[PDB]
Amino acid sequence: VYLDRKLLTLEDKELGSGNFGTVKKGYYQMKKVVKTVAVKILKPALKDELLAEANVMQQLDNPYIVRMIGICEAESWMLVMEMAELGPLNKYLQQNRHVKDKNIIELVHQVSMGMKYLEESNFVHRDLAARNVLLVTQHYAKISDFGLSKALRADENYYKAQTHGKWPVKWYAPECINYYKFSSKSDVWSFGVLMWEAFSYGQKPYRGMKGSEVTAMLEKGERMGCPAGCPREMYDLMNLCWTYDVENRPGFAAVELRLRNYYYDVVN
Ligand SMILES: Nc1ncnc2c1ncn2[C@@H]1O[C@H](COP(=O)(O)OP(=O)(O)NP(=O)(O)O)[C@@H](O)[C@H]1O
Ligand SMILES: [Mg+2]
After folding, report:
1. In what order do the strands lie in the sheet with 87-88?
2. Is 150 helix (H, G, I), strand (E, B) or coil?
């Protein structure tokens, strides 16, 4: 089942670009309302990758995950998604230093809610970073980019990668680097890095370090420090996400609960 090209209107300007091609803003005529959308436009593996991305998104339904409207094929093969007007979380915080810690807590908590749902759904994101969190409003975040995502088999709690590819190593847990094992707990490690990025206002983690130097740092039990003005309770949570041993590392249910309670304590 596909979208009708005649019901899609594209704006010529591009929101982004990838190896696949470009991302463009558009409008899709729904039953009555016209919906603003973001469209990934493919320019053979590139097509297989986008189709696998669509296959994952088709199965997800959560307020904190970017929804796929559908696939459209006419002059080009297209992946139609809902539009997150404010763009990537890292770029937004870089340009909006006035954002309060309470607001950052709210957004990272929303990411933890989407990840809690992903974990329950038995999918591993594998690219959970601040650049992949898209903002609908300054108070509404959604997880995007299911390009490296995997639906875990009914009998396993991890996805085993064959060989090391183009990996975002700085966001990867030690078992990913060492055993090529990807689980919801490895996404928890990435979520810790994402939290650090968010409280650092979109600064890059492990500044000026090579991937191998990051692995060597973590193996010595060393971790990134507390970002300037970051609540200590949030830094403690990042360190819990960065638990070396996968078995002792918390899952998204524990992480979301810790975040939820801390946010409501701040509200109180
Ligand atoms: N659903 C969406 N809503 C709003 N903007 C989007 C959406 N999807 C993608 N974009 C924009 O397009 C950019 C690139 O898309 P992305 O999913 O990151 O693909 P990519 O292959 O990783 N390209 P790049 O980030 O440059 O390495 C994002 O950083 C957003 O600015
Ligand atoms: Mg990208």
Report:
1. 87-88, 133-137, 140-143
2. strand
User: How far away, in angstroms, is 154 Cα from ligand 1 center?
Assistant: 31
The method recorded for this entry reads X-ray
Cβ(136) to ligand 1 under 6 A? no
In short, whether 128's Cβ falls inside 6 Å of ligand 1 is no
The alpha carbon of 242 is separated from its chain's Cα centroid by a whole number of angstroms, namely 17
Say if ligand 1 is within 6 A of residue 16 CB.
Answer: yes
Query: Domains of the chain, with CATH numbers?
Result: 1-83 (3.30.200.20), 84-268 (1.10.510.10)
Residue-wise burial string across 232-259, b where 16 or more C-beta atoms lie within 10 A, e elsewhere: eebbebbebbbbeebeebbbbeebbebb
Ligand nearest to the CA of 18: 1
- Long-range Cβ contact pairs of 61-64 (< 8 A, separation 24 or more): 62/113, 62/114, 62/117, 62/118, 63/113, 63/114, 63/142, 64/110, 64/111, 64/113, 64/114, 64/117, 64/141, 64/142, 64/143
